Symmetry: D2
Amino acid sequence: PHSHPALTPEQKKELSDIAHRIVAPGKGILAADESTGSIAKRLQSIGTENTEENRRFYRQLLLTADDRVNPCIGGVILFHETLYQKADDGRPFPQVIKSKGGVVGIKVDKGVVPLAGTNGETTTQGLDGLSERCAQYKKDGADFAKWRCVLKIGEHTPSALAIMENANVLARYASICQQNGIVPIVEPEILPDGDHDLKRCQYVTEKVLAAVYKALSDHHIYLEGTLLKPNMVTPGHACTQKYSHEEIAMATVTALRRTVPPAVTGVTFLSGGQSEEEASINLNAINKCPLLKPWALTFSYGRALQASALKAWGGKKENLKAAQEEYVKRALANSLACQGKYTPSNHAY
Amino acid sequence: PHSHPALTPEQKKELSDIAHRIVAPGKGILAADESTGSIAKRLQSIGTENTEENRRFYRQLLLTADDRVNPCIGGVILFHETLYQKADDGRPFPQVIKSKGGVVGIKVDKGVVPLAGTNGETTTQGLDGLSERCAQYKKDGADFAKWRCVLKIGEHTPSALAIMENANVLARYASICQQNGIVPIVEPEILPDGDHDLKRCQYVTEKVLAAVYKALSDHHIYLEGTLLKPNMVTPGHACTQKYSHEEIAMATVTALRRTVPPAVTGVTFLSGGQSEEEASINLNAINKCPLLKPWALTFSYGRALQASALKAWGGKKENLKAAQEEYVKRALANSLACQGKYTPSNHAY
Amino acid sequence: PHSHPALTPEQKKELSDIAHRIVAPGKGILAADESTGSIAKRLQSIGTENTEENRRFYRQLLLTADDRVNPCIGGVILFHETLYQKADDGRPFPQVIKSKGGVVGIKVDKGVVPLAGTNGETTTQGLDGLSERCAQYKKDGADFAKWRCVLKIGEHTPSALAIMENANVLARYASICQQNGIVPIVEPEILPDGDHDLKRCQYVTEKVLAAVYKALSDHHIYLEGTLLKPNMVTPGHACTQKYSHEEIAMATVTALRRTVPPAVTGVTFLSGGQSEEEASINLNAINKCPLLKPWALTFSYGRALQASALKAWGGKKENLKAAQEEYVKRALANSLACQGKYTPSNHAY
Amino acid sequence: PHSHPALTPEQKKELSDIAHRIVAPGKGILAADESTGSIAKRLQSIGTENTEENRRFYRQLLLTADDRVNPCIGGVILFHETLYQKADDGRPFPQVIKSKGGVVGIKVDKGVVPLAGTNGETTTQGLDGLSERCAQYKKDGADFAKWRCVLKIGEHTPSALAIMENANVLARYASICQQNGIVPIVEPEILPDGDHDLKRCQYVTEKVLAAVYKALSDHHIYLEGTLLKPNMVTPGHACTQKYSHEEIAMATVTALRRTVPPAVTGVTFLSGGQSEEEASINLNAINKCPLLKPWALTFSYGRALQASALKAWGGKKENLKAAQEEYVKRALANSLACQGKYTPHAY
Ligand SMILES: O=P(O)(O)Oc1ccc(C(P(=O)(O)O)P(=O)(O)O)cc1
Ligand SMILES: O=P(O)(O)Oc1ccc(C(P(=O)(O)O)P(=O)(O)O)cc1
Ligand SMILES: O=P(O)(O)Oc1ccc(C(P(=O)(O)O)P(=O)(O)O)cc1
Ligand SMILES: O=P(O)(O)Oc1ccc(C(P(=O)(O)O)P(=O)(O)O)cc1
């Protein structure tokens, strides 16, 4: 029952200022941190060989887009490899991002592993040596980080063990990040797979997020220096009932209002399986929801910002500006959506 | 991980409507629910005998003040006895309250009991047969309830057992109230006794409230149909260090922003040991605090609304209007304070 | 992390001595504590009116059986009414029990109540005023108590909430009993209803018992002064697969070896839906199970000791000796079974 | 509320048989798994240079003692390096251990790390890639593993966070081991530092162990295929009050009887700060305690088995026979103590 402060006032200020910079009005996050296994599939989807040089070129493609994205992008998440690559002009990518007014982020988790005794559930590893990696990433230009936990809605899932363990590892990761001046993004993703309906996803999301923020409290996490990266509340991919974007927005906002303390600086949704345009409408509806939302509601999009750019690129160097244009389109679209400015019964929740 | 709805949409709307009526702008709660053992202390302090008649008269004195209190008082909490008494004009007190535009509340707990193996810590009893009582109180005009848990800041307290146990019984009480159409006020009071400083009270309050709302989630409580009745974050009564009202307001709003989900309809502060004027000033500073506060921040005052009325009464029949005037003063003062309209480095928190 | 002892060594000795007397070798408990609503059903099965006198006579019939039961019955559980009734010769029933070498027990819970938001699950009430009741029961001759919690195996049950809440209320009850020199019997009954198999029951029983003993630790319960009243591990009533008595015994002892600390003085199984002969055979098989069992394994039987006696009685005063003989037969049978002397691989668990 | 079995019956049998071999009557564990930084302190204490060869030689010294230790030693815990070193006759140390009737163990954690917001409390790291390491150690002859968590008795410690977090990481480590056919030794150590008395240690030990076994239940651990490595219940190093060996035994057995389920196969005590003889006397008292003890109560000793051997060696190759004799003495002493045959309600 006695306080042994984890952070000084100066440390708290740095973390709060970083978090606010990332989700400042009209701004969101580009998730360009696809692991080397995940980036392989993207390149194979456009028949391009997965070489370090192709990965560098594609990342450079997104980071050097014209200055129209500067007011759209508050932060860019990178994979380890990309953090130490350089643009053609010799500038390290963290410097490119900074010079366009962005914060640099680093994904630090090491993937999921199975939880024995469960119905195919997982936790996430990566805590070993994390403090030294974070101190190193801080030196090399990173100011926030990402850690992804995965949960699945099934007949017996997510179980009490899975929720508790994923919530606990998220808190540990957040604790280590804040000790090294890094803002942790807490991502408890509930997959959209299955035939569950909207209200079931809302129920599960509410139970996961309540576990998350109890754990963050237990581990003394400074919420003003955190961000939340949740799934939107949506029906399962295999659900037959159809829902309006207004219903998606109402259920999403409702789940957050019931679990996310106001001290959290911002919520940066993941797009999941949504299409580029679907992810922009939904995010816009969420910001038009009449209910009171005491946190920034913006984006941390990977595919929903890159899908078109990747295809217009096709691996051909001469399609550089055509691909950048598709990326700039989505960045401008979602900069409007996270302000509710995008145009192409609460008791029931 | 499967939903079995505790409340229908129609039940939710009733509870939410009640909760909002109570904390509507400019309105607060009169706490006239002193148990017969506590009201005995009040009458003794003005040398008045503790008879049912004096208790009935004293309550009548407050409930029948002139219509300047109608926009100030959203709700009145009563003890069991008073709920079935009548004013001099024969009208049952619940009818008097409603006719003046107030909601009727009832205290339903049966006092504290010791927790074996702890250093003088307690839990609260009163769950047995609570559902049938609630159904009866509902019929007889009550629309919300009160339950008081007490925690103490000390060398080894509040302990993990004390926090877990009091949070859990509050959730049981709230669950039963909502099944019977009654809005539960959740009151986990941290006593101001001791020489602890402001930061220690803020730390305990943040830990206690995190446990409360995790327990409310585990028990499926509908937060829009609840109110929270917490202490303000203050130093101990015996703390040597001095603090401004702005500092108390900053500590209080920070603790709440870090724990209370936006879905909670209102926060009705208890006055504790504060004087009448001190309680109104602090509530006013709380409502002027620049930070974002997504709930109503109003009052549930007993002593802070009654102290002057009681002394002016003194048991004399002829001092009725002198006493009623002192109560109308405090009702008007606190109606202004809960709007920030009353005049007599956040990272360091 | 600081001990504030709940009990003195003298208090500990008293509780431990009571507990060992009850489950001394060859001894078990007669459960004659049916509520007036539960005993009414039994009387109706023999077309006998539910009057206080018939209830008195029936209880007298059991309590005054001939002295062949004295070494069989270490304790007798009574309902409130029966604790204050007298035999025909004027002797209070507690004195009847004590003079035959038994300990007097009292049922102290006030029945189950529904948990809102669950699939028909319950918790139990009765804590209100329990401390005053226990001290009074102690004065009037009772030395141990019983509290029944009920959990159900279903598609989504027992839930996390139901396990947590019932474990917590059992520990509260146990703490209060021990403060008044009363040995608590902790009864977390998992019902046999449903089509579940033996493995499913063993799993649930293991998780229930683990939660029970964690709660008892959190509440500072003295295990040597407690007894456990669990179900045997059995298939559901509606299960099609058939199991031998040796498999039931192996599953039961395995579940217990994995969850019950050796400090627990004894285990007094409930019979559930089992017949008189079935409950005796299983208990015998349990005590012959080759595994190591560091606690007494005996019986706390109601129907499995009374069924034949109740039928032979039929309400007729003249069937006294015929009825008593049937009760004595089962008491002698079960006294042999709890020693493994009654006659009418493990890695797969 | 639905079972998804973590282990098959075949997997349970393998784990149970391993665990029973390690703690078979008269047998205990030699803890020779000192990390490279801890063994550096040991060698420095006898003015010996910390070289791979010196570490190899010292470990060989212990593992090749004469066959009088065979009935005393059910298991040997090794550090990663030693697992892949060889004796002078070319045999890998795991083969040496097995040929003398012992089971090979491996330390798999990666040290303690601070818990932010606490008063100097720690958790332990080492889960990343533990499944692949365990599978590899199994191929290379290891059949059980060790993971150490450390807790401290202070004015505000151990806190709810530290107990919960350490209990949870222990359960994760135990879960991964059992999926790879390795018996986990669960070691939640409460340090003897401080001026606390016996009662305080008994209280803390009971709370820590209750949390450990709830965690292990939550994570579906097969207790019959696990071992416990706890401290003995003793007063703090700086406590003025004196206690007899019978009181230490009574407090230790009582703590265990109130927390450790009978299904656990064995309890292998750590020696902590105790001298070789103090550890042997206390272990003997524990095994003679009149209360009923449904698990093997033996030793997992490092310093309490090696102290005299290290000093008799002194780094000199010609003291090989002298050093080995001192080790065989303690192995014989403690093999008797864990049978209770060694002689030189208030809880
Ligand atoms: O679902 P897919 O179509 O296979 O594509 C994926 C899958 C997972 C991820 C993860 P990772 O980078 O850790 O692999 P994250 O979304 O957290 O970046 C990224 C892209
Ligand atoms: O501090 P005191 O001078 O003793 O006055 C008191 C003490 C307690 C209460 C309780 P109760 O009504 O349950 O007794 P509550 O604040 O909940 O009304 C009310 C007034
Ligand atoms: O099995 P049934 O036919 O429904 O009869 C019953 C049902 C419940 C009980 C309870 P109670 O006495 O508290 O009501 P307990 O098992 O605790 O004696 C006793 C007999
Ligand atoms: O107390 P010291 O004098 O510092 O010696 C020590 C300290 C710690 C250990 C650990 P480690 O080998 O993991 O560091 P373990 O007890 O687990 O072997 C071993 C020896």
